[PDB]
Coordinates of N, CA, C and O in Angstrom, one line a residue:
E1 N 260.0 154.2 61.8 CA 260.8 155.4 61.0 C 260.2 156.2 60.8 O 259.1 155.5 59.7
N2 N 260.1 157.5 59.9 CA 259.3 158.9 58.7 C 259.7 157.8 57.0 O 259.2 157.8 56.5
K3 N 261.8 157.6 57.1 CA 261.6 156.8 56.0 C 261.0 155.9 55.1 O 260.3 155.8 54.2
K4 N 260.5 155.2 56.4 CA 259.5 153.3 56.2 C 258.5 154.3 55.9 O 258.1 153.0 54.9
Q5 N 257.8 154.5 56.7 CA 256.0 155.2 56.2 C 255.8 156.0 55.3 O 255.7 156.1 54.5
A6 N 257.7 157.0 54.9 CA 257.2 157.7 53.3 C 256.9 156.7 52.4 O 257.0 157.0 51.7
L7 N 258.0 155.2 52.4 CA 257.8 155.0 51.2 C 255.8 153.5 50.9 O 256.0 154.4 50.0
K8 N 255.7 154.2 52.1 CA 254.1 153.4 52.4 C 253.6 155.4 51.3 O 252.4 154.3 50.6
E9 N 253.9 155.8 52.1 CA 253.3 156.9 51.8 C 253.1 157.7 50.3 O 252.4 157.3 49.1
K10 N 254.0 157.1 49.3 CA 254.6 157.1 48.1 C 253.4 155.7 47.4 O 253.2 156.2 45.3
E11 N 253.3 154.7 47.6 CA 252.0 154.1 47.4 C 250.7 154.2 47.3 O 250.1 153.7 46.5
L12 N 250.6 155.1 48.7 CA 249.4 155.2 49.0 C 249.2 156.5 47.2 O 247.8 155.9 47.2
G13 N 249.6 156.6 47.2 CA 249.1 157.8 46.1 C 249.3 157.5 45.2 O 248.9 158.1 44.6
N14 N 250.9 157.2 44.3 CA 250.3 156.0 43.8 C 249.3 155.3 43.2 O 248.8 155.1 42.1
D15 N 248.0 154.8 44.0 CA 247.7 154.0 43.9 C 245.8 154.8 43.7 O 245.3 154.4 43.0
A16 N 246.0 156.2 44.9 CA 245.2 156.8 44.2 C 245.6 157.5 43.0 O 244.7 157.7 42.3
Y17 N 247.0 157.7 42.5 CA 247.6 158.4 41.5 C 247.2 157.6 39.8 O 246.6 157.6 39.0
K18 N 246.5 156.3 40.7 CA 245.8 155.6 38.5 C 244.5 156.0 39.0 O 244.3 154.9 38.2
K19 N 243.9 155.8 40.3 CA 243.0 156.0 40.3 C 242.3 156.8 39.6 O 241.0 157.8 41.2
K20 N 242.7 158.3 39.0 CA 242.7 158.9 38.9 C 242.4 160.5 39.8 O 241.6 161.2 40.1
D21 N 242.4 160.0 41.1 CA 243.1 159.8 41.9 C 244.0 161.5 42.5 O 245.2 160.7 43.8
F22 N 243.8 162.6 42.1 CA 245.6 163.2 42.0 C 245.2 163.6 43.5 O 246.6 164.2 43.1
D23 N 244.2 164.6 43.9 CA 243.9 165.0 44.9 C 244.9 164.2 46.3 O 245.3 164.6 46.5
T24 N 244.5 162.7 46.3 CA 244.6 162.3 47.5 C 245.7 161.2 47.1 O 246.6 161.7 47.7
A25 N 246.6 161.9 46.2 CA 247.4 160.7 45.4 C 248.6 162.3 45.9 O 249.4 161.8 46.2
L26 N 248.9 163.2 45.3 CA 249.4 164.4 45.8 C 249.6 164.8 46.7 O 250.2 164.9 47.9
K27 N 248.5 163.9 47.9 CA 248.2 164.2 49.4 C 248.9 163.5 49.9 O 249.6 164.0 51.1
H28 N 249.0 162.2 49.9 CA 249.9 160.9 50.2 C 252.0 161.8 49.8 O 252.6 161.0 50.3
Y29 N 251.5 161.8 49.0 CA 253.0 162.2 47.5 C 253.8 163.2 49.2 O 254.5 163.1 49.1
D30 N 253.1 164.1 48.7 CA 253.7 165.2 49.8 C 253.4 164.6 51.0 O 254.4 165.1 51.8
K31 N 253.0 164.2 51.6 CA 253.1 163.5 53.2 C 254.6 162.5 53.1 O 255.1 162.6 54.1
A32 N 254.9 161.7 52.3 CA 256.1 161.0 52.1 C 257.5 162.0 52.2 O 258.3 161.7 52.4
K33 N 257.0 163.1 51.5 CA 258.0 164.2 51.5 C 258.9 164.9 52.9 O 259.8 165.3 53.2
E34 N 257.2 164.5 54.0 CA 257.6 165.4 55.0 C 258.4 163.8 55.7 O 258.8 164.8 57.0
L35 N 258.2 163.3 55.0 CA 258.4 161.6 55.5 C 259.8 161.4 56.2 O 260.7 160.5 56.4
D36 N 260.0 162.3 54.6 CA 261.5 162.0 54.3 C 261.9 163.0 52.8 O 261.7 162.7 51.5
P37 N 262.2 163.6 53.3 CA 262.5 164.7 52.3 C 264.5 165.0 51.2 O 264.0 165.5 50.5
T38 N 264.8 164.4 51.8 CA 265.8 164.0 51.3 C 266.1 162.5 50.7 O 266.7 162.4 49.5
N39 N 264.6 162.6 50.1 CA 263.9 161.6 49.0 C 263.6 162.6 48.4 O 262.4 162.4 48.3
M40 N 264.4 162.1 46.4 CA 263.9 162.5 45.6 C 262.9 162.8 44.9 O 261.8 162.7 44.1
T41 N 262.8 161.0 45.0 CA 261.7 159.9 44.4 C 260.2 160.9 44.9 O 259.1 160.6 43.6
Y42 N 260.3 160.7 45.6 CA 258.5 161.5 46.1 C 258.5 163.1 45.4 O 257.9 162.8 45.6
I43 N 259.4 163.6 45.7 CA 259.3 164.8 44.5 C 259.2 164.8 43.2 O 258.0 165.5 43.7
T44 N 259.4 164.0 42.3 CA 259.1 164.1 41.8 C 258.2 163.2 41.6 O 257.4 163.5 40.1
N45 N 257.6 162.2 42.2 CA 256.0 161.6 42.3 C 255.1 162.8 42.5 O 253.8 162.8 41.1
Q46 N 255.0 163.4 43.2 CA 254.6 164.9 43.5 C 253.7 165.3 42.3 O 252.9 166.4 41.5
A47 N 255.3 165.6 41.2 CA 255.4 166.7 39.7 C 254.7 166.0 39.2 O 253.4 166.4 38.3
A48 N 254.9 165.4 39.3 CA 253.5 164.0 38.3 C 252.2 164.1 37.8 O 251.9 163.6 37.2
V49 N 252.2 164.6 39.1 CA 250.3 164.9 39.6 C 250.0 166.7 39.0 O 249.1 166.3 39.1
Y50 N 250.8 167.2 39.6 CA 250.4 167.9 38.9 C 250.8 168.3 37.9 O 249.8 168.9 37.5
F51 N 251.8 167.0 36.8 CA 251.4 167.5 36.1 C 250.2 166.8 35.2 O 249.4 167.0 33.6
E52 N 249.2 165.8 35.7 CA 248.1 165.7 35.2 C 247.1 166.7 35.7 O 245.8 166.8 35.0
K53 N 246.8 167.4 36.9 CA 246.0 168.9 37.2 C 246.0 169.1 36.8 O 245.7 170.1 36.7
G54 N 247.7 169.8 36.1 CA 247.3 171.2 34.7 C 248.9 172.1 35.6 O 249.0 172.6 34.4
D55 N 248.9 171.4 36.7 CA 250.1 172.7 37.0 C 251.9 172.1 36.3 O 252.3 171.8 37.3
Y56 N 251.7 172.2 35.3 CA 253.0 171.6 34.9 C 253.8 173.2 35.0 O 255.7 172.0 35.0
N57 N 253.7 174.0 36.0 CA 254.4 174.5 36.3 C 255.5 174.1 37.6 O 256.5 174.6 37.8
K58 N 254.1 173.7 38.4 CA 253.9 173.4 39.5 C 255.1 171.4 39.2 O 256.1 171.4 40.2
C59 N 254.6 171.3 37.9 CA 255.8 169.8 37.6 C 257.1 169.9 37.6 O 257.9 169.2 38.1
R60 N 257.3 170.7 37.2 CA 258.9 171.3 36.8 C 259.9 171.7 37.7 O 260.7 172.1 37.6
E61 N 258.6 172.1 38.3 CA 259.4 172.8 40.3 C 259.8 171.6 40.8 O 260.5 171.7 41.3
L62 N 259.4 171.2 41.8 CA 259.3 170.1 42.1 C 260.3 169.1 41.5 O 261.0 168.8 42.8
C63 N 260.3 169.1 40.3 CA 260.9 167.8 39.9 C 262.1 168.2 40.2 O 263.0 167.9 40.6
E64 N 262.8 169.9 39.1 CA 263.9 170.1 39.5 C 264.6 170.6 40.8 O 265.8 169.9 41.1
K65 N 263.4 170.6 42.0 CA 263.1 170.5 43.6 C 263.9 169.6 43.7 O 264.5 169.1 44.7
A66 N 263.8 168.2 43.4 CA 264.4 166.9 43.1 C 265.4 166.2 42.4 O 265.8 165.0 43.4
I67 N 266.1 167.4 41.9 CA 267.1 167.2 41.0 C 268.4 167.3 42.5 O 269.2 167.3 42.2
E68 N 266.9 168.4 42.5 CA 268.3 169.4 43.8 C 268.6 168.4 45.2 O 270.1 168.8 45.5
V69 N 268.0 167.8 45.9 CA 268.2 167.2 46.3 C 268.5 165.7 46.0 O 269.9 165.2 46.7
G70 N 268.1 165.0 45.5 CA 268.4 164.0 45.6 C 270.0 164.2 44.5 O 271.0 163.5 45.3
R71 N 270.6 164.6 43.7 CA 271.9 165.1 43.1 C 272.6 165.3 44.2 O 273.6 165.7 44.1
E72 N 271.6 165.6 45.6 CA 273.0 166.9 46.6 C 272.4 165.3 47.5 O 274.1 164.9 48.2
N73 N 272.0 164.4 48.0 CA 271.5 162.7 48.7 C 271.8 161.4 47.9 O 271.6 160.2 49.2
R74 N 273.2 161.5 47.1 CA 274.0 160.9 46.5 C 272.0 159.5 46.0 O 272.9 158.6 45.7
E75 N 271.5 160.3 45.6 CA 270.1 159.5 44.3 C 270.4 159.3 43.7 O 271.0 159.7 43.1
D76 N 269.5 157.7 43.1 CA 269.7 157.1 42.1 C 269.9 158.9 40.5 O 268.4 159.2 40.7
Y77 N 270.7 158.3 40.2 CA 270.4 159.7 39.2 C 269.2 159.4 38.0 O 268.7 160.7 37.1
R78 N 269.5 157.6 38.2 CA 268.4 157.3 36.8 C 266.8 158.1 36.8 O 266.3 158.2 36.3
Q79 N 266.8 157.9 38.5 CA 265.2 158.4 38.8 C 265.4 160.7 38.4 O 264.6 161.0 38.0
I80 N 267.1 160.5 38.4 CA 266.7 162.2 38.3 C 267.1 163.2 36.7 O 266.4 163.3 37.0
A81 N 267.1 161.8 35.4 CA 266.6 161.9 34.3 C 265.8 161.7 34.3 O 264.8 162.6 33.0
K82 N 264.9 160.7 35.3 CA 263.4 160.5 35.0 C 262.9 161.7 35.0 O 261.5 162.5 34.0
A83 N 263.2 162.7 35.6 CA 262.0 163.8 37.0 C 263.0 165.2 35.3 O 262.1 165.3 35.1
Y84 N 263.6 165.4 35.2 CA 264.1 165.9 34.3 C 263.4 165.9 32.5 O 263.1 166.8 32.3
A85 N 263.3 164.5 31.9 CA 262.1 164.3 31.4 C 261.1 165.4 31.6 O 260.6 165.3 30.8
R86 N 260.4 164.6 32.8 CA 259.0 165.9 33.3 C 259.3 166.5 33.2 O 258.3 167.4 33.3
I87 N 260.6 167.5 33.4 CA 260.3 169.0 32.9 C 260.5 169.2 32.1 O 259.5 170.5 31.4
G88 N 261.0 168.5 31.1 CA 260.6 169.0 29.5 C 259.0 168.9 29.1 O 259.0 169.2 27.8
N89 N 258.7 167.9 30.0 CA 257.3 167.0 30.0 C 256.5 168.4 29.3 O 255.6 168.8 29.1
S90 N 256.9 168.6 30.9 CA 256.4 169.5 31.0 C 256.5 171.3 30.2 O 255.5 171.9 29.6
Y91 N 257.4 171.5 29.8 CA 257.7 172.6 28.9 C 256.3 171.9 27.5 O 256.4 172.6 27.1
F92 N 257.2 170.6 27.2 CA 256.8 169.7 25.8 C 255.0 170.4 25.3 O 254.6 169.7 24.1
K93 N 254.8 170.8 27.2 CA 253.4 171.0 27.2 C 252.8 172.3 26.9 O 251.9 172.3 26.4
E94 N 253.4 172.9 27.8 CA 252.6 174.9 27.7 C 253.8 175.3 26.3 O 253.9 176.7 26.4
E95 N 253.8 175.0 25.9 CA 253.8 175.2 24.6 C 255.5 176.2 24.8 O 256.8 176.3 23.4
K96 N 256.4 175.1 25.8 CA 257.8 176.0 25.8 C 258.3 174.1 25.3 O 259.7 174.4 25.8
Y97 N 258.5 174.4 23.7 CA 259.5 173.4 23.7 C 261.4 174.6 23.5 O 262.3 172.6 23.6
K98 N 261.9 175.0 23.7 CA 262.7 175.2 24.3 C 263.4 174.7 25.4 O 264.3 174.5 25.3
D99 N 262.8 174.8 26.4 CA 263.2 174.9 27.2 C 263.2 173.8 28.2 O 263.7 172.9 28.6
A100 N 261.8 172.5 27.2 CA 261.6 172.0 27.6 C 263.3 170.7 26.2 O 264.5 169.9 27.0
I101 N 263.2 171.3 25.3 CA 265.0 170.3 24.8 C 266.1 170.8 25.8 O 267.5 169.5 25.6
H102 N 265.7 171.7 26.0 CA 267.6 171.5 27.5 C 266.8 170.6 28.4 O 268.4 170.0 29.2
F103 N 266.0 170.6 29.3 CA 266.4 169.6 30.6 C 266.4 168.0 30.0 O 266.7 167.3 30.8
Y104 N 265.7 167.7 28.5 CA 265.5 167.0 28.2 C 266.6 166.3 27.8 O 267.1 165.4 28.1
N105 N 267.7 166.5 27.4 CA 269.5 166.6 27.1 C 269.4 166.5 28.2 O 270.9 165.4 28.6
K106 N 269.5 167.6 29.6 CA 270.7 167.4 30.2 C 269.4 165.7 30.8 O 270.5 164.8 32.3
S107 N 268.2 164.5 30.4 CA 268.1 163.5 31.1 C 268.7 162.9 30.6 O 269.4 161.5 31.1
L108 N 269.5 163.7 29.2 CA 270.5 162.1 28.7 C 271.5 162.5 29.2 O 272.5 161.1 28.8
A109 N 271.8 163.1 30.2 CA 273.5 163.4 30.5 C 273.7 162.7 31.9 O 274.3 161.8 31.9
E110 N 272.7 162.1 32.8 CA 272.3 161.5 33.0 C 271.9 160.6 32.6 O 272.8 159.2 33.8
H111 N 271.2 160.2 32.5 CA 270.9 158.5 32.3 C 270.1 158.6 31.1 O 268.7 159.2 30.9
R112 N 270.4 158.0 29.9 CA 270.3 158.3 28.6 C 269.2 157.0 28.2 O 268.5 156.2 28.9
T113 N 268.2 158.5 28.3 CA 266.8 156.8 27.8 C 266.8 157.4 25.8 O 265.5 158.4 25.6
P114 N 265.6 156.3 25.0 CA 265.1 156.2 24.7 C 263.9 157.1 24.3 O 263.5 158.1 23.0
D115 N 262.9 157.3 25.9 CA 261.4 158.5 25.7 C 262.3 159.7 25.8 O 261.4 160.1 24.9
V116 N 263.1 160.6 26.5 CA 263.8 161.6 26.2 C 264.2 161.8 25.0 O 264.3 163.0 24.8
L117 N 264.5 160.8 24.5 CA 266.2 161.4 23.4 C 265.0 161.4 22.3 O 265.2 162.2 20.9
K118 N 263.3 160.2 22.3 CA 262.5 160.7 21.1 C 261.7 162.0 21.3 O 261.2 162.8 20.3
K119 N 261.7 162.2 22.6 CA 261.1 164.1 23.2 C 261.5 164.5 22.9 O 261.0 166.2 22.2
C120 N 262.7 164.6 23.4 CA 264.1 165.8 22.4 C 263.6 165.8 21.5 O 264.1 167.3 20.5
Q121 N 264.2 164.7 20.0 CA 263.9 165.5 18.6 C 262.7 165.8 18.2 O 262.2 166.6 17.5
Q122 N 261.8 164.8 19.0 CA 260.1 165.9 18.9 C 259.9 167.0 19.0 O 259.3 167.7 19.1
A123 N 260.4 167.8 20.4 CA 260.2 168.6 20.9 C 260.9 170.2 19.6 O 261.0 170.7 19.7
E124 N 262.0 170.0 19.2 CA 263.2 170.1 18.2 C 262.1 170.3 16.6 O 262.1 171.5 16.4
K125 N 261.6 169.5 16.5 CA 260.5 169.0 15.2 C 259.6 169.5 15.4 O 259.2 170.2 14.0
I126 N 259.7 170.0 15.9 CA 258.0 171.1 16.7 C 258.2 172.2 16.6 O 257.4 173.0 16.3
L127 N 259.2 172.2 17.1 CA 259.2 174.2 17.8 C 259.6 174.6 15.9 O 259.6 175.7 15.6
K128 N 260.2 174.0 15.4 CA 260.2 174.2 13.9 C 259.0 174.4 13.0 O 258.4 175.7 12.2
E129 N 258.5 173.1 13.1 CA 256.7 174.0 12.6 C 256.2 175.1 13.1 O 254.8 175.5 13.2
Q130 N 256.6 175.0 14.7 CA 255.4 175.9 15.5 C 255.8 177.4 15.2 O 255.7 178.9 15.1
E131 N 257.9 178.5 14.5 CA 258.0 179.3 14.3 C 257.9 178.9 12.6 O 257.1 179.6 12.0

């Protein structure tokens, strides 16, 4: 079943993801998505690659898209929050702290974590120094 291979593709991409091979990583990650589009974990991982490639827009694009699928397939909400963190992180990098804190707080709504809570206060305290 593609579902099983999808799990392997995520690891194949993750493996290449740890070896700076973001291109090959996104390739396998994207493959896992075709093998199992209902699995938001694969989509979120894809965005993680774009975040490393510089495509913060695509990161927030696929991440939220993963939120849609996951929140629809009763997928782990904890992962949904981690995705929300990446969305806010994408903004946190493109100087869009306004949208960052937004999705950041959304991560606290799904799965409260010290990371996002730290980036939430970090994004607002930085935005103040920005204005």
